[PDB]
Design a protein around this ligand. Structure first.
Ligand SMILES: COc1ccsc1CNCC[C@@]1(c2ccccn2)CCOC2(CCCC2)C1
Lengths: 227, 56, 284, 234, 335
């Protein structure tokens, strides 16, 4: 840098200072768990946001067991999902929330379409997405108690005839869980973590921590090369 | 009904335009490309000394 | 007899140099040493390449029956050989510890595991090894016995105390501590992998877990099986003097060749079976 | 943006003194800092420089080893420790903030000055102010000439000449940076022109307020050397 | 009734387009001498982004350029020296666009936060801070371009475009003609008009002063991702997810030419034009960037070297270099 002038050398030094700041911020970002959040208002996504927490995208930064978790809520946007779906190709896990009681409620559209069978298609379209083939999916089933009362009061046979099981809470919940697991077309690459949302915050946050911990183990093994 | 009426009015306004022959536009395009062909650095190579970007 | 031993040392040296150089070349060309694990692999390949480079001098000494290279070259050969043995053994330990931290401590794995920290630990391993190699280097001379010069270690009075202390320290530090660290870390790692819900519940996934466990067992088995006879043989020989015989010489050189074979086979087992490197080999 | 210096007063020769400049209303950590001295009835002189982040430090040779510059970014303070002061150090010391990048305006803002009274370079480019005083009337266009000992035209093509104005009894302000760009906040009366080794400042439609001591500075290589200083008067 | 009338009007417009087009552009351009093979060597490599770059915009001085990354950084680069000039931390982590003002006083960014952020770079204080936030879009910000230092055109995922006054802080003009997400916009040299392409496979020409749609261009089979004017302001090229690019002339109001190749089936991310407009550079999803001769319709060159998928491409104002941004966090300048 003899040829370079004093201002040129000072500019190079400013560049190196910027490079240092960018490397430090990248080292900070490399310790941040980035979680995608999906679901609708009926699903109870807001409820999990409130429980876990302690216009286009809502960010809910939090810490658990000295680990930084970043959750992004893209539900508010009404724009086409496909155009910005590739923007999240660097996400540790996808938390998808549905409501067990959605099947009874039918939207008052021109034609009658079951909400639960919409949520199944939404899960299928998210899960089989090329961008998210290796990304894991945590599945939250909200309104368990209301599901219990609803299943005992009204049978599930009326919505979809294929189910032949009796009107039992545990059996119906297990059937819904197995159907959602069956929706995935690439089981070998993608774990699905199914859970029944508890009133206690700590249980749900712990389950998210465990799933994220498994994803971190998978990433570490891939970096090591065992997988 | 109002939105459809607005769309129909927009289509009517678009239809009433001064169409010109494609040949004319093609001649203008070729003429502009030929006129600025020498000026363009990408099209015609520029000596390394004249070139601002050089190997470091 | 002598020709067969020379051929064995030759073949082991050629395979070791080819493997080590090729692994280093692959890491430099594509990996560019971006990641930690790859730096550890490069370090292991380097140390093993140096040890294989030091192997022909030993073979020539065995055939010729005397050391004509000189005292200075003998010191360089001794220091480099011991330094490589300690560096390779510690590099293997550090890799076992790294994998233990990664699997067992996932949250802390992100903070602890960085290329900078891996470089620091590798430099520390080279430094710790220095303490072994350099004193051994000055002590190592060439003493003519029965008309034949021998490149070996010399200890000032009391010679027996220094000899026993060096043998005990090299033995325990290079065998007892590494086998225990590798065994405990990989065993806990395998238990944690079994606990993981991803591997269980699927036949293909369970098969992948079985493959991982099998590879880990193979690496541990190779290291223990190769290192154990030479160390046990040295301990036996040192403790009780045994009259020289042709079978004794053949067994001694066979154990030494087995140790060098381990040095040659460690980069293969690690780098070649590594999935990222496997991907790179598969593409070409 | 504000800079105020403290630590003045009288000092005995061979003693020691620490000056401190406190900065307010800007990102202190991102600016390089200068100390510039001014003799009582003579021109300004550059003393020292410390980069942002303290990565490079430069000193004049007359003050090399005697003066130590330092900065504390969390308190936004610049420190100058002076040991073994001599009778030539009775000067007013200014602090200068300067940022260096493509299109930046370094030496834009000047401190207020702390007076210190110590009561009892062939290689370096030399700036030549040929005139010393010019009597002017408000309205006429006035030209000022500066010369260099070395061609200030670098390979990139940006000349490293700066034009400064010091009003009587006030801190000097930057007028033109790099001889072709006016400093933000300067009226368009000033224009810079010329070539390597010969430079000219033209003040068209001059005003009485504009009148001050004009300084030409090179910024090709350290140590920075100032000009004699052309004074205007009425 | 109204739908039938609309269809009749569309049929009349199509008949006018068919009757209007007499001589094919390819036939007229057949006699022009070919450009052969164009080879552009890498000059500068920019690093330190550490995330998938999405947007780069050249300044009018042909030396500075802005870049947008998904770590929450806007980086302003000196292209000649490789040094970083500015590093702006962003309030919103996800940024899909970034506009560099012609004067260079301000930098505009935007993305999934529904906000367009204007950053002052000539502040006396010396720290790049948020100057003005353009809040009011219902969808994600997809493209933005400065006209002056006070007025900006932005496109959003609510099917609309807007003309925002920076000092006022409100959107002076609303453009609502599209039926799909508007993915890009381009300003003409006069700046009196701007064409924008949407996710309904159509582009529309909007008058900034008046506020209505002058012309509507159809012909694509899939979503239009990129749009750029020809240097004379009378034509514009569009790239779409159907692995094709098209050239539309404003006065002709029809599809002059189509640039497609059988081997490449991936969509076009961004398109840019050279100073003479003879070469059209389009960044495909095949990890390469193709240089197509505009008149001949053949392929004149290939810019390979981006390992991850290309996300943006821009030719500088004087035409002396092309800088490509990819998701591998490397900005490469080709000359
Ligand atoms: C005969 O001594 C000479 C002569 C020329 S070099 C030299 C020194 N080689 C000794 C190299 C040894 C070795 C063999 C295989 C693998 C690793 N380490 C031989 C056995 O003992 C050890 C020391 C304690 C156990 C291993 C070193």
């Amino acid at each position: 840098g003899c040829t370079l002038s004093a201002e040129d050398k000072a500019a190079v030094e400013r560049s190196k200072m910027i490079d240092r700041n960018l490397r430090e911020d990248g080292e900070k970002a490399a310790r941040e768990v980035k979680l995608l959040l999906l679901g609708a208002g009926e699903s109870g996504k807001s409820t999990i946001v409130k429980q876990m927490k302690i216009t286009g995208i809502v960010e809910t930064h939090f810490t658990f067991k000295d680990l930084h978790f970043k959750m992004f809520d893209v539900g508010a946007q009404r724009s086409e999902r496909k155009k910005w779906i590739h923007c999240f190709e660097g996400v540790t896990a996808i938390i998808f929330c549905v409501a067990l009681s959605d099947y009874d409620l039918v939207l008052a559209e021109d034609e009658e379409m079951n909400r639960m069978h919409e949520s199944m298609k939404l899960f299928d379209s998210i899960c089989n997405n090329k961008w998210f083939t290796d990304t894991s999916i945590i599945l939250f089933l909200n309104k368990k108690d209301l599901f219990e009362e609803k299943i005992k009061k009204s049978p599930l046979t009326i919505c979809y005839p294929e189910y032949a099981g009796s009107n039992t809470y545990e059996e119906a919940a297990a059937y819904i869980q197995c159907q959602f697991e069956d929706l995935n077309k690439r089981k070998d690459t993608k774990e699905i973590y199914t859970h029944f949302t508890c009133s206690t915050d700590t249980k749900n946050v712990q389950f998210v921590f465990d799933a994220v911990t498994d994803v971190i183990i998978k990433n570490n093994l891939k970096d090591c090369g065992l997988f | 009904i109002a939105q459809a009426r607005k769309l129909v009015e927009q289509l009517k306004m678009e239809a009433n335009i001064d169409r010109i022959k494609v040949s004319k536009a093609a001649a203008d395009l070729m003429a502009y490309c030929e006129a600025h062909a020498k000026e363009d650095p990408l099209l015609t190579p520029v000596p390394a000394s004249e070139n601002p970007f050089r190997e470091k | 007899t002598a020709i067969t031993i020379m051929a064995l040392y030759s073949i082991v040296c050629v395979v070791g140099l080819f493997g080590n150089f090729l692994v280093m070349y692959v890491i430099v060309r594509y990996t560019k040493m971006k990641t930690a694990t790859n730096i550890y692999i490069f370090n292991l390949a380097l140390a093993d390449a140096l040890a294989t480079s030091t192997l022909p001098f030993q073979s020539v000494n065995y055939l010729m029956g005397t050391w004509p290279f000189g005292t200075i070259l003998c010191k360089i050969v001794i220091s480099i050989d011991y330094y490589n043995m300690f560096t390779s053994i510690w590099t293997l330990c550090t890799m076992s510890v790294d994998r233990y931290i990664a699997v067992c401590h996932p949250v802390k794995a992100l903070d602890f595991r960085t290329p900078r920290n891996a470089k620091i630990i590798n430099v520390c391993n080279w430094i710790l090894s220095s303490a072994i190699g350099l004193p051994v280097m000055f002590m190592a001379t060439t003493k003519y016995r029965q008309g034949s010069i021998d490149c070996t270690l010399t200890f000032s009075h009391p010679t027996w105390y220094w000899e026993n202390l060096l043998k005990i320290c090299v033995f325990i530090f290079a065998f007892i501590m590494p086998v225990l660290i590798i065994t405990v870390c990989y065993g806990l790692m395998i238990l944690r992998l079994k606990s993981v819900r991803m591997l269980s519940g699927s036949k293909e996934k369970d098969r992948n877990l079985r493959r991982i466990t099998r590879m880990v067992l193979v690496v541990v088995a190779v290291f223990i099986v190769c290192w154990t006879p030479i160390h046990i043989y040295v301990i036996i020989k040192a403790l009780v003097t045994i009259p020289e015989t042709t079978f004794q010489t053949v067994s001694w050189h066979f154990c030494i060749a087995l140790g060098y074979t381990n040095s040659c086979l460690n980069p293969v087992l690690y780098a070649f079976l590594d999935e990222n490197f496997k991907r790179c080999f598969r593409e070409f | 943006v504000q800079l105020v210096e403290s630590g003045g007063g009288l000092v005995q020769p061979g003693g020691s003194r620490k000056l401190s400049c406190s900065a307010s209303g800007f990102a202190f950590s991102s600016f390089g800092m200068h100390w510039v001295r001014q003799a009582p009835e003579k021109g300004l002189e550059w003393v020292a420089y410390i980069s942002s982040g303290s990565g490079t430090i430069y000193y004049a040779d007359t003050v090399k080893g005697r003066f130590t510059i330092s900065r504390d970014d969390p308190k936004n303070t610049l420190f100058l420790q002076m040991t073994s002061l001599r009778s030539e150090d009775t000067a007013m010391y200014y602090c200068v903030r300067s940022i260096y990048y493509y299109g930046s305006s370094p030496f834009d803002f000047w401190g207020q000055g702390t007076t210190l009274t110590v009561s009892a370079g062939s290689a370096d480019i030399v700036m030549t102010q040929a005139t010393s005083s010019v009597p002017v009337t408000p309205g006429e266009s006035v030209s000022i000439s500066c010369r260099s000992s070395k061609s200030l035209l670098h390979s990139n093509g940006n000349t490293y000449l700066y034009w400064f104005l010091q009003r009587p009894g006030q801190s000097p302000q930057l007028l033109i940076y790099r001889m072709s760009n006016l400093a933000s906040g300067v009226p368009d009366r000033f224009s810079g022109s010329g070539s390597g080794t010969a430079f000219t400042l033209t003040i068209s439609r001059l005003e009485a307020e504009d009148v001050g001591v004009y300084y030409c500075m090179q910024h090709l290589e350290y140590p920075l050397t100032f000009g004699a200083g052309t004074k205007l008067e009425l | 009734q109204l739908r039938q009338e609309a269809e009749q009007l569309k049929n009349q417009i199509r008949d006018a387009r068919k009757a209007c087009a007499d001589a094919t552009l390819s036939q007229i351009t057949n006699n022009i001498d070919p450009v052969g093979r164009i080879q552009m060597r890498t000059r500068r490599t920019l690093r330190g982004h550490l995330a998938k770059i999405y947007a780069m915009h050249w300044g009018t001085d042909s030396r500075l350029l802005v870049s947008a990354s998904q770590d929450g950084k806007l980086i302003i680069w000196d292209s000649y020296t490789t040094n970083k000039v500015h590093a702006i931390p962003l309030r919103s982590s996800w940024v899909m666009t970034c506009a560099y003002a012609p004067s260079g006083n301000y930098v505009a960014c935007g993305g999934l936060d529904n906000i367009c952020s204007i950053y002052n770079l000539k502040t006396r204080e010396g720290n790049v801070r948020v100057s003005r936030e353009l809040a009011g879009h219902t969808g994600y910000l997809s493209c933005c371009r400065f006209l002056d230092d006070n007025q900006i055109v932005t496109s959003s995922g609510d099917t609309t475009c807007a003309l925002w006054d920076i000092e006022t802080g409100q959107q002076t003009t609303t453009f609502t003609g599209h039926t799909g997400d508007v993915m890009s916009l381009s300003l003409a040299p006069d700046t009196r008009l701007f064409v924008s392409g949407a996710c309904d496979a159509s582009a529309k020409l909007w008058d900034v002063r008046e506020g209505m749609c002058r012309q509507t261009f159809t012909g694509h089979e899939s979503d239009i991702n990129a749009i750029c004017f020809f240097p004379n302001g009378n034509a514009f090229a569009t790239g779409s997810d159907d692995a094709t690019c098209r050239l539309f002339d404003l006065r002709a109001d029809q599809e002059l030419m189509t640039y497609s190749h059988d081997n490449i089936i991936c969509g076009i991310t961004s398109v840019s034009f050279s100073k003479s407009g003879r070469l059209l550079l389009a960044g495909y999803d095949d990890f390469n960037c193709n240089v197509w001769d505009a008149l001949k319709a053949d392929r004149a060159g290939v810019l390979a070297g981006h390992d991850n998928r290309v996300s943006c491409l821009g030719v500088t104002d004087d035409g002396m270099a092309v800088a490509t941004g990819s998701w591998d966090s490397f900005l490469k300048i080709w000359n």
